[model samples]
Target chain A: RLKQLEXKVEXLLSKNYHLENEVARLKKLVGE
Target chain B: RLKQLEXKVEXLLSKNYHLENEVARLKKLVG
Candidate 1:
């Protein structure tokens, strides 16, 4: 259903935001 | 609208997958 997909996307969007932040922090730590 | 939402979700899913992979790689690098 569209609602389920919307919920999934919302979760994924939040997860992706955190993952992006982690990646940035890790890259800084690794001297990227 | 449903189709548009689905397409958006699909793109976001793929982007999130790549972001996860990048996060893993970055973690390894930092370690």
Candidate 2:
């Protein structure tokens, strides 16, 4: 999951307009 | 970082920024 998420994350970050949201979600997870 | 307002349709990702190197990178990210 992490492996794939990492790839998708880069794409999402570079191409998307929501790096802020992504970072927030990541922080919230707290690794489940 | 929409600026923490939305996530895409998929399951959503991240608990760590460095995902490919998740294990090692997470460790470092903490430090």
Candidate 3:
């Protein structure tokens, strides 16, 4: 269970990174 | 450790929801 949780967190971290990047990109496009 | 992980996951889930909403709002604004 611990290992699974670790993996899940890693995945979420990656997802979070991408989401942040996306927000940045959109904001740039909007000139915000 | 497990409890900590659960809390972290919950926080991330909340963050994810907001991020998704932000994305949607931006798209609508752009359109």
Best by DockQ: 3
lDDT of 1 by residue, B1-31 (tens): 6887788788889998899898888878777
- Candidate 3 regions exceeding 4 Å error are none
Best by the lDDT measure: 3
Q: Residue-wise lDDT of candidate 1 within A1-32, one digit each (tens)?
A: 88987887798889889888888888889899
Candidate that would win on TM-score: 3
lDDT of 3 by residue, B1-31 (tens): 9999988888887888899898888888778
Q: Write the per-residue lDDT of candidate 2 for residues A1-32, one digit (tens) a residue.
A: 55555667576655333544454455555652
Predictions in order: lDDT: 0.85, 0.47, 0.86
Superior by DockQ: candidate 1 or candidate 2: 1
Give each prediction's root-mean-square deviation over alpha carbons.
Answer: 1.3, 12.8, 0.7
- In candidate 2, list every pair of residues with a backbone clash: A18-B2, A19-B1, A20-B1, A20-B4, A21-B1, A21-B4
Give per-model TM-scores: 0.82, 0.25, 0.94
Error of 2 at A18 (Å): 11
**Candidate 1: DockQ?**
0.71
User: Residue B18 of model 1: what lDDT?
Assistant: 97
Computed on C-alphas against the true complex, the DockQ of each candidate is 0.71, 0.05, 0.77
* Clash pairs detected, candidate 3: none
